[model samples]
Target: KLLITIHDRKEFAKFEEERARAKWVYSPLHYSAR
Candidate 1:
């Protein structure tokens, strides 16, 4: 399970990229782990 706190959709996208850079496995659903 993944959990993250973000201010908005753009912020979420930013974090998503960060996670990707870190090689964190995740789903295509941006809010799935919220």
Candidate 2:
């Protein structure tokens, strides 16, 4: 899965895309922020 931003839509989108492309986070299973 991935994350999308709000408010600063275009800017956040492009930047997030670039960052995700450069380095992606991998979560196998049962991983939660909280």
Candidate 3:
């Protein structure tokens, strides 16, 4: 359900390393109570 328009691996890697800490991490749908 993610959408990315940027086509740069280096930038993507950097974004993942910098932003993908806690908030950026997605939880498994099966674990949800809903």
Best by lDDT: 2
lDDT of 3: 0.71
Q: Write the per-residue lDDT of candidate 3 for residues 1-34, one digit (tens) a residue.
A: 9876676877878877977564554578757763
- Show the colliding residue pairs in model 3: none
Per-residue lDDT over 1-34 for candidate 2, one digit per residue giving the tens place of the 0 to 100 score: 9676665898878888998679566785877774
By TM-score rank, best first, the candidates go 2, 1, 3
Models sorted by lDDT, best on top: 2, 1, 3
Q: Which of the two candidates, 1 or 3, achieves a greater lDDT against the reference? A: 1
Give candidate 1's TM-score.
Answer: 0.34
lDDT of each: 0.73, 0.77, 0.71
- Listed per model in order, the count of residue pairs whose N, CA or C atoms clash below 3 Å is 0, 0, 0
Model 1 lDDT tens row, 1-34? 9765556777879988898688556677776555
